[model samples]
Target: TTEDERRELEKVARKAIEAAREGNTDEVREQLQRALEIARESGTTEAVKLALEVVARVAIEAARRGNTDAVREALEVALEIARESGTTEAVKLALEVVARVAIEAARRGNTDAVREALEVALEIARESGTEEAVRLALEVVKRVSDEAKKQGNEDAVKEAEEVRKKIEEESGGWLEH
Candidate 1:
């Protein structure tokens, strides 16, 4: 690509991200798909990772607005990227967004969504499943719980607590902290 062409592509990607931050879902999906393609064609680890990050964020914000399909898509993309990079951090961050989705689902009493989100989290734990990963997951849930509580959501509190209990029962007492 010519320098001007490359700059235009970069400009487009940045504009898309700005639109996404403003909640323009269609633009986010469209532009991220394009940007990811360009990044993937370059075949570098950083490009792939950065593209994956952008895709995940676009999917996550959509999920937070109750888009289950976006959540799954994001998870799939993030998992693929994680495997390619041989890194747990990507998956962990993806799970954190999914956990937030779960919290919202629980707040709305959507038991199935909550279950799905928890299952994803458990899958990540099983994959990495380290103490520090568990701690980060716990912190994400706790943080979401705090947010929900602040919004006067009693069910959110209960749902997050339920998830906490399950985590403890399933993988309890590994860390002193």
Candidate 2:
């Protein structure tokens, strides 16, 4: 991609990101869609991948707004694009977005969402060999387990313990190892 094209895509992506942050999902989606089209039409796969990452960011914001369905749809599409392109950077960004959304879901006491997110995060971490992601997942699991224990939810506590054991085993008993 030419420098000018890159700049243009960046501008469009930034605008879409801002709109998403301002609570305008429609505008965010529209702008990002246009940006994606432009990137693809221009044969700028790198730019398209970057714009898709912005879409993931917006989707994460939507999730924070309690728009779970929208988040899932956006993330699903973004993940598809990332995988289709086979770009490490795109996959990394998607994983980060998933991790953030999952952590937020856990904070809201959404165990199902948290578990789903952690599963994805674990996959990405294992694939990418990112020790940081693995460590973060461990911490999230611990936090959720602590919360469940505080609420006197034995099942939740037990589930959390199981997750902890799994994490420990998967990490080879060392988070950074």
Candidate 3:
């Protein structure tokens, strides 16, 4: 019944969660990787669901700690799992999280990181994102643009606007606004 796989996944995933609680970014990464591998090999939706649950929690913790690098690592892991799992919805969710992180990056005045994060989000969205994902991408781009505008960073504003328009164009321009 794959209870064995499920138990193993729970064990490793809880370890990852514990590391996340301790603010041990490296240990969280290592344990999550082990959990992800077990989930991958188990090849069950239930296993994958647990792995992603751990990923989301750990990723949030990483973001709270301002560990942008670990956040990016978490994104990569999530996207890979989503892509291979063949769920476009999951892909959209992953990009949305990355886009949200970019907003945090914008708040910190790291326009470059904001741009990089959004670019990666946009790229992945183009690959497998849904119409709703496109809309979410545009919405995030608008937020990024406004943040840049508030900061008086003309270049960042222009870049974010371009991304916004690009998303509109890709979505066939029906997303007027």
Candidate 4:
């Protein structure tokens, strides 16, 4: 029944995402809690981590829609679970969420939050040393650069470009392959 439980977990996560897109923070929390319970009951640690990632997506969606409170709650839950999970992949996923938060922040013209979040994302990308992490880092860098230039925000554009080079360097070997 592990497979069955995992499917249920995914279903709940999907429902949570649907709620998130509609700006229903309460339904998101409710479905996410259901997903977590199913994940925990499934006897698979992978499912638990997957739930964490699902929460990250919910947080990202919340951020995109300017739901500040839900963003905080979902991200806190995601990070706490990432810490408890204690795996590089878990940490990497959390960092990806944080990086996307920066992307969303820039999209919203929140220059300050974008810079702050981008710095943390840059740190995680360099330290995590994973291909996906580096890739995501570059993605955030690109997003920040575009948004800053669009807003004519000079300082953040410079910062993002600088981070861009470092991540490109880090991804050098992989990109060649």
Candidate lDDT (C-alpha), each: 0.59, 0.60, 0.67, 0.68
Each candidate structure's TM-score, on Cα atoms with residue i matched to residue i, is 0.59, 0.50, 0.62, 0.57
Q: How well does candidate 3 match the true structure in TM-score terms? A: 0.62
Candidate 1 residue lDDT tens string, 1-177: 344435645665576546644666566556755655655465555565465656555554554455555445455555555455555655665666666666666566444445556556655654565787677667766775776676666766776688778777766543432
Please give the ranking of all candidate structures by lDDT, highest first, separated by commas: 4, 3, 2, 1
What tens digits encode model 4's per-residue C-alpha lDDT throughout 14-93? Answer: 88777877878788778866765665566466776677667767766666676655565566565555555657766677
Candidate 2 stretches with Cα past 4 Å from truth are: 1-39, 42-49, 110-177
Error of 4 at 73 (Å): 1.9
Residues 1-177, candidate 3: write the lDDT tens digits.
Answer: 478877776787677656655667787778767766876787777767766666666655555556655566666676677677776655666666666666666666655556666776676657653677676777778787787688776766877887777776776533342
Higher-scoring candidate on lDDT, 2 or 3: 3
Q: After superposition, which runs of candidate 4 have C-alpha atoms over 4 Å from their true positions?
A: 43-45, 110-177
- Distance from true position, residue 83, model 3, in Å? 1.8
Question: Distance from true position, residue 157, model 4, in Å?
Answer: 7.2
Clashes of 3: 0
Winner by lDDT between candidate 4 and candidate 1: 4
